[PDB]
Design a protein around this ligand. Structure first.
Ligand SMILES: NC(=O)c1ccc[n+]([C@@H]2O[C@H](COP(=O)([O-])OP(=O)(O)OC[C@H]3O[C@@H](n4cnc5c(N)ncnc54)[C@H](O)[C@@H]3O)[C@@H](O)[C@H]2O)c1
Ligand SMILES: NC(=O)c1ccc[n+]([C@@H]2O[C@H](COP(=O)([O-])OP(=O)(O)OC[C@H]3O[C@@H](n4cnc5c(N)ncnc54)[C@H](O)[C@@H]3O)[C@@H](O)[C@H]2O)c1
Lengths: 331, 331
């Protein structure tokens, strides 16, 4: 069993925790945040988006006891102090949002861990992996990134479309749920002025590197994709809108058939497929990283198409963080 | 002044009413809905989106008195019974959403009006006009349409881009505010299943003919544009995202300069321009039909670009309804 630590018990930290509770191959042995143990237990027990936790949670002698297993709780702001080897944590999930460079993430190795997975795109040349797209390119690196939720939705889709028909060029928009970085009412966001504006009141444009990042995980698409985002007033679940110019002609039904085939084969469990009249809440809790929406998209012609794919930005990404942990542990 | 009637005193009906109150060339002489005069006064007086009406509103002898002028209030379900001649209403704004064919709209002419402006796209081949784009093509027709809010946003933008650089092909997404057709909680929408789902809970994909309609008001673009929509949990203000392949190379700066020039010249008061870090609420109450957002869009390369333009779907469209009324009255 792979023993892991979580640094940052936030939306992703807690949903990674939840995702682990039905896996036999991974066990959480310690959690670090800026919280007392009793408060951590409360944050795990109750969830506005995903409902009440479906295990037993208690606090005993300053540790979390979840379904019988003791979990060390610490509140070290500096992860270099974490003594991960003392609880046998070999991989740390770095989900604070704050430690996205080699130097900062490597504090966990200074503290006794063997490997680290960042839960966001790096600010340096730390390698990014996306399950089902380029994870097999892993070369034993101690510190890696699982990219972003948006990259995890776009990349599996772009893989299939590019392999089957070729992407000459593509532009992406993601319509994305509100996140923790945003504000309830207009407030200060000195590095992202639009992102300070009240989240529930507004459609809020945002830059995103997620489309360009697809060219890092699919090198054939380097320079062939970019995009942007709109943040909107929903609490979870997002959607990619990819407008692509194709190398070779394909009707909309041929495109749908290729995606369906991929969802049943190579990308099973990663890329999914629906023909139902779905809305965002229908994807809340779905562990797929990309769910292609047949009826939502549209072709102008045989070489210019708009493709729509959903992603539960909390749940799917979190399950794939653990898939990446398992992958790098076996390789 | 041009004496007009309004049929359907809803979001558009009321915002058309509000748009008329600082024009000296148009006078509202009668309003029809399914409502008592006292309730109609209440609906005008108070508005969740646009605030309190800034005039005096009184009810006297079952008519509205607004700023000391008498306005007839009726509640005829069948517009053939409206006796528009009795109040001297020459043009009728048809804003119920129900009478979008020649035969249904023409009931107003049977009822004594001379011309009708439908406030949505027709279900038949009634001619559509967009101010600044094809209104000069008007040929004296009795029954016309002002198209949709979305077409009024996209058409002025597409006009500038096509005229300056040429559009090979384009695909549009609009991220659109909730409207009256939607439901507060999951409810019945037999002709539009997704649109029945709870509006405030969901991102809701939706079909729209607005991009294809641009090809009717700009014939050179026939067959070159299509698109779709996402409905999101905001009360007003929407945005167009146009992804276009260009006939000749243009930098993002050159594109912006062409839009700025059009906004100051030919399309002044129709298409606007901002370089600020705006969000949707900043456009609430803006009477422009298209507001180009410099910082939100992005070029992949000199021939493939994503262009973002806002629209207050209530206010902009309503002002342009009155501009069309004035135009058809003088031509
Ligand atoms: N929410 C999503 O949809 C999503 C999806 C994919 C990736 N991500 C990424 O994952 C990261 C976390 O996102 P989130 O949405 O979970 O954020 P979040 O704000 O919900 O969680 C961050 C947590 O880190 C804790 N924290 C802050 N400083 C700390 C420190 N010095 N030591 C320990 N804990 C600390 C906070 O108390 C909080 O519980 C970010 O990089 C984000 O971009 C988020
Ligand atoms: N709201 C927008 O953003 C927007 C923008 C552009 C165009 N439009 C179009 O304008 C039209 C009206 O839209 P809205 O959003 O104002 O709708 P709405 O539902 O707010 O208003 C419709 C009004 O018509 C009244 N009505 C219904 N049946 C009637 C009848 N038989 N006789 C008289 N009145 C009747 C209703 O009581 C209601 O007040 C629709 O075609 C819509 O697509 C709407």
């Amino acid at each position: 069993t792979i023993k892991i630590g979580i640094n940052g018990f936030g939306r992703i930290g807690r949903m990674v925790f939840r995702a682990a509770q039905h896996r036999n191959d991974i066990e959480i042995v310690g959690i670090n945040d800026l919280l007392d143990a009793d408060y951590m237990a409360y944050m795990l027990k109750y969830d506005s988006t995903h409902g009440r936790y479906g295990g037993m949670v208690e606090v005993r002698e300053g540790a979390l006891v979840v379904n019988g297993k003791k979990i060390r709780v610490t509140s070290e702001r500096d992860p270099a102090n974490l003594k991960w080897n003392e609880v046998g944590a070999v991989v740390v999930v770095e989900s604070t949002g704050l430690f996205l460079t080699d130097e900062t993430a490597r504090k966990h190795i200074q503290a006794g861990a063997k490997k680290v997975v960042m839960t966001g795109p790096p600010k340096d040349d730390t390698p990014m992996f996306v399950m089902g797209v380029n994870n097999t390119m892993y070369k034993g690196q101690e510190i890696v990134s699982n990219a972003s939720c948006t990259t995890n939705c776009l990349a599996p889709l772009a893989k299939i479309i590019h392999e089957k028909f070729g992407i000459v060029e593509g532009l992406m928009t993601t319509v994305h749920a509100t996140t923790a970085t945003q504000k309830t009412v207009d407030g200060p966001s000195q590095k992202d002025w639009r992102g300070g504006r009240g989240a529930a009141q507004n459609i809020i444009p945002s830059a995103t590197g997620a489309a360009k990042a697809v060219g890092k995980v699919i090198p054939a698409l380097n320079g062939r994709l970019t995009g942007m985002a709109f943040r909107v007033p929903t609490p979870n679940v997002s959607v990619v809108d990819l407008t692509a110019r194709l190398e070779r002609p394909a009707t909309y039904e041929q495109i749908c058939a290729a995606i369906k085939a991929a969802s049943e084969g190579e990308l099973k469990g990663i890329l999914g497929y629906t023909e139902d009249e779905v809305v965002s809440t229908d994807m809340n809790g779905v562990a797929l990283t990309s769910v292609f929406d047949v009826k939502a998209g549209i072709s102008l012609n045989d070489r210019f198409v708009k493709l729509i794919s959903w992603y539960d930005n909390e749940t799917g990404y979190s399950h794939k963080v653990l898939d990446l942990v398992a992958y790098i542990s076996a390789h």
